[PDB]
């Protein structure tokens, strides 16, 4: 990388954001003609979620939109990253549009523009329409075309007022956990060949969606991966190099959760070399036309980084420190991940990066004083943002940072047992209480991070 | 039932048969334009089959048809029950017919008619075309139409020479083990509502397939269930009634492996009442028209009976006797199952019955004398046929009995570790050796079971 | 408010803090072996070194007196003082605890000594541990050594810590050392040997100096739906219920024997092969007079008006180890135990696991721990107000330490320990607590 | 052909046939308790009654002589003769075995007594079983009691049956009594104690009458692919290989200590916490001279020229318990053992589980067992032809019986047992074997 220098710090037009996802916050899962999604069915299956929690109601954000928009303004957030519920706008996934569904996102986007908050719209954050699941979901050859139709509808109704789109959130997770480990919807444990087939169809879906998002008003399009940065043992050149190689490595026994497996097709138009020699029963035919479609020009790379892994000089994973600082969900705190992650991604692909998620699960409660004190989240945020500022100094093009999450919400298989919000939600009353971290982040934005 | 008494014994036209299934014997899994089926893929997944056995080659029946036909005639078998490989005649499951696949079954049927043996063709014995699995298989609303199209092709090409059809074999198992327990292809563990959805789509497929099989030549059409008969504690009326009720019972927590859940729809055009009360997420919509489609008139009920369970006077399950006679697969020998199973089915539905499978897994070997002695199989067959003869005497209309199997073969998740054959197969050489039970059965057929 | 002479304390256990597992002729304990068995502990952590408290006794004593703690609850490593579990006493082991107790008395801090905090000497484990008919006698000998060498200076003893856990987790579920999953009859045999062991240890501890003797249960209090009389009775009955299929973790299975001299009725009616013979003399031996009941309370469960446990509230406030925060537990637990047994209560453990770290400012901020303590202590103070006799409250723990099968992944300390340097850093909670003690809880 | 003095026998074990588990002062054993634990045994079968051989000794002896058996291998129930494992001898227990041995001698049948066939007295289990330092002494005492009451009329002794199984399955995998899953060091400790126990038992069995003393291993012979020297040597190496990750079920791990007075090399390099101290005195004690090596061989595995274990053939002939039929096992097992240890070999167990039943003709036809026996015995004959010292062959088993974790679901008998009525029906294999004995296997 070519350095930029410290002086400026964070860019003047840096998107200080917060992120949510449809299923995690919206509720009203069976209202206003919305079609079932795979998480509605998965979450209602005995044993799949922590204490059989589900997203039926969640934060009831569908009905409390106004209140949450006021929290965004109050905090002084520049950008709001959210996902559209495919099944809310297209109950069957294709064909008939649901106007009540469109109306909701319309009211959200008007509320955002009225408050001068830049919409960042995730098209797919895991809530596959159930009707499409009944037709084989991402195993179906037509799944790219289904997604394209959805993309077209998105652009049609929201292309006017929304200029930031992300096609897919974390294919590593929704394919890996959804279809390999089976812990996420729809809860399958499929063979390698089918994982490759699904990947291939998700990536082609991405291409077609990009094309659909290009028709009409100009906009910035992104793709978000789950990233677990390899943190080098030292600043020695060989150690950095080993961490870089390990970070972008993949093989037929361990690919679905990697960066390279997804980002190489998107950005370089090629899978990792190993893919070409796989001959397993039922492998998809991967063509040159496929790879051109997949690698449509996009504007930014989205990184979801929560933590990384310390590697040795040779790129092997170092044993975790005893009593290493950790979060409420069990993950370690590794501040340098928000340096090395963006750095290596910039070095490899030479693209603008947005941190589409960064946040911490904390055992938050309402204290006797009626407030929610989350110093651990503040320290986490403080530490991670310093590392991201260092990455910008060393010449990484970073255009935005999105705190996960605006609200405590339904954390997938962990239910409501993990609170990631800068805003606390009491689920008995649906009361919002802004946490200390919320005000901390507000001050950062107002000072554009100059005082970190 | 009105008895006929024990003078006549087995009817004059009784179909003495043996039974196989496509995937279990054919092999040639990747030849002659045959498309993949779910078992090709499932069996190649690590850990799914005993010692990773698969049906790639199986008994190589595809190439050794003439030797197998010769065994049939040498034994004097009246009828041969087999299944057609959907994926062999329709590689994508729909659309393009594969004429080399047709030619195989053509040469089988000609071979049979030439030897005066009556073909009993099963359409679906679990080998769903992989291409259709990728479209969601039986979860897909169109899966009935797929099957219908298959059935039409069946009728078109084989309706001339084949007069006995079975639409589905053991939906209890291919749905229950395929989609609930996940031990069989495609290896899923789906919620209750999806099992009902699959069941309903399978049953509608049956309806449509019957209609296709009715167009053109006249034939007899059946539907085969896996049945575990409840054997009453005694001949007292109340003990019998209790066994009857247990046998035909089902509920939302135990239905997929039951008789009534499948046979009530087919034969009486109604689900068990509990189904209409369920409202789980994403239950299929069951219409009056659906039930009329499902309940096309058919000519016989198929029962696959290997063993039953002894019940107390209240219909509760009695504890299995210590050291009860059992088989190599671990199942108990329960002779009375082949009396009570047919009897109760006869009483409930008043339809002709065929025993479409009965047989035993034995730890068979080639002895020093070069022969295969299976006296345990002989005794099993003798005892069960005695019981079937008694059912016929007590007024059960039984039109045939098919021994499972003609050949040792691929026994699904148990691979080649379970031999059910009246003919031994050495898989190293593909040598067939008719077992003692084969000659025993030959004698039964020639005497029409008069000497049992 | 809180009584004038209230034992404001903090608590630890030998294996969780000491380290120095293989020095000065200390014999092996079951945790030394168990912890070294791959897969038994989070990331194969072990207490070989732990907080190195063996070697940093002085520093930790200064923390105690800096916080102004009135009493220090700790356990004695049975294997450190009796390496084979019986016979030859090890004087270098005694020296350590002697040095500690001196340090405590020099700072005016009342020692509260737990005899058995789960670190069964391995040599005794090779002889069948608590399945052995002689196991009560082994303990008695250990309790006699304790009185001999420490009875002069120590007048608060706890025989056993959480029999629910070291038996239930150690021999039923198998998540704790020695990691067994034994039949019901052997669980009862173990329980009966432990309870007889307690009796004999009480008698040993009664010879010589006058002292207060206690017994500590892991208690999960049933919190009534409301203050309605019937909801309270339903909660009480649930709290003190037990049966053949769920007893090892209950209060009544252990405390009724100790305090009422009888097991729950169902225990006698069992006749599983190999069940121990429970005699009248056994029960008289078990039910020696003791001076207080120890309650380890972390959280409880809410019960409906019929005694049925309610489902945990969605998004309930919780701790870093996953447990819910249920403040009312430190009211109802003491109150119900007081009502049933009419003995003085000692809260021998109360605390919270937090995801603590050193912030950019070099301090350890644990506001959650502060709220937890504040809330729970309010409840205990209300129990006192309503006439419940509570003689002491010990915060778990003085130090972040080895949390058994969770290793070092759970920090319960009012003092943070960086395990890389063994540096102690007092958390905000430590100063909060200091202030609570100074004011005897009058500002809660 | 087969030698003139060949010991053509059949074999049983106490717990598998005797029943009468709770009578005539017999103490509990681990299998009494384990088998009553929910879900430990196939359909919760136990040996409370088994074949009721205790109460039907005459009938079973009559079958033994009817078959023309030359030797009868049985085990003595430790807990039947010493109800507490040590101390008071139970003379009603002794009487039974005295009656058995009388009935054998009376019928001209050579007794072959197994001391330990897995039924450890429960009292000793409570004292830590084979983990306890005194367990070799417990067994020594037992072996002295055996010699005292049976040394006059019994000249064939086997100290331990299948240490591979009772230690491997009993304490590593946990599928057999007592049902534990212990660390490597505790397995080696148990092995060492069993082995030392063996040594003391030999010395006890030497005091008085001269006798033949053996040690029985569970053996899985490696069958060379071909008769090539390379394939043979590779099979030999694999057959006697072991390592710290895979030793408890091997031959070398147990037989080297007994016969060569050394453990395999890898044992030197284990430094795990709790590892037993193996002294040279221990090794000399273990490695007492013995008269024969007992092999229990059911099947083997085929190894390529490299020594790598070959995959099982698709559709290989197998038994009702799932094992493959590998006739050559009863050639290479003896030969390789004979070459390594230069000791006389006794096939102390060989047979086949079959899905046997009473046919309509009222007979029990078991042609598979007949073929199995014929195929294996031909292979044993060929070993004797090639100069392997084999002193006898004992068909497992006389009766269908309690097959441990598989309960009564696996029938190994040459006599069928109907558990409803306890009727015995000699199978075709019994008669087949009778004929082989009368002809001394000349017609094989």
Automatic annotation (TrEMBL), chains A, B:
Q: Which EC class heads this enzyme's classification? A: hydrolase
Keywords per UniProt: Glycosidase, Hydrolase
State its Enzyme Commission number(s). 3.2.1.21
User: What is the protein name for this chain?
Assistant: GH1 beta-glucosidase
């Amino acid at each position: 990388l070519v350095p930029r220098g410290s002086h400026m710090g964070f860019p003047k037009d840096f998107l200080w954001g917060t992120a949510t996802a449809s299923y995690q916050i919206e509720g009203a899962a069976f209202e206003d003609g919305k079609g079932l999604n795979i998480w509605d069915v998965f979450s209602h299956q005995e044993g799949k979620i922590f204490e059989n929690h589900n997203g039926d109601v969640a934060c009831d954000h569908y009905n409390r939109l106004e209140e949450d928009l006021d929290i965004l303004s109050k905090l002084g957030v520049k950008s709001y990253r959210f996902s559209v519920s495919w099944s809310r706008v297209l109950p069957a996934g294709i064909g008939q549009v649901n106007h009540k569904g469109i109306a909701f996102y319309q009211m959200l986007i008007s509320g955002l523009r009225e408050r001068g908050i830049i919409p960042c719209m995730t098209l797919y954050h895991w809530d596959l329409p159930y009707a499409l699941h009944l037709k084989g979901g991402w195993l179906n050859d037509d799944s790219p075309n289904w997604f394209a139709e959805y993309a077209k509808v998105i652009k049609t109704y929201f292309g006017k007022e929304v200029s930031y789109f992300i096609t897919f959130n974390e294919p590593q997770v929704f394919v890996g956990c959804g279809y390999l480990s089976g812990n996420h919807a729809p809860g399958y444990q499929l063979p390698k060949a089918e994982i490759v087939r699904i990947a291939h169809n998700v990536l082609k879906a991405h291409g077609l969606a990009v094309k659909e998002l290009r028709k009409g008003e100009p906009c910035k399009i992104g793709f978000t991966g789950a990233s677990c940065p390899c943190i080098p043992a030292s600043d020695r050149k060989e150690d950095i190099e080993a961490a870089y190689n390990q970070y972008f490595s993949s093989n037929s026994n361990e690919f679905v959760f990697t960066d390279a497996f997804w980002f190489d097709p998107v950005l370089k138009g090629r899978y990792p070399k190993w893919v070409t020699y796989i001959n397993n029963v039922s492998m998809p035919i991967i063509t040159k036309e496929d790879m051109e479609l997949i690698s449509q020009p996009i504007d930014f790379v989205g990184l979801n980084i929560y933590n990384g892994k310390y590697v040795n000089e040779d790129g092997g994973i170092l044993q975790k420190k005893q009593g290493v600082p950790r979060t409420a969900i069990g993950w370690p705190i590794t501040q340098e991940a928000l340096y090395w992650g963006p750095r290596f991604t910039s070095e490899r692909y030479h693209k603008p990066i947005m941190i589409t998620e960064n946040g911490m699960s904390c055992h938050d409660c309402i204290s006797l004083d009626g407030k929610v004190h989350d110093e651990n989240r503040i320290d986490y945020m403080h530490r991670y943002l310093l590392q991201l500022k260092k990455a910008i100094a060393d010449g990484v093009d970073v255009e935005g940072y999105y705190a996960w999450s605006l609200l405590d919400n339904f954390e997938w298989a962990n239910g409501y047992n993990d609170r990631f919000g800068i805003t606390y939600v009491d689920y008995e009353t649906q009361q919002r209480i802004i946490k200390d971290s919320g005000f901390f982040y507000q001050q950062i934005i107002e000072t554009n991070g100059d005082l970190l």
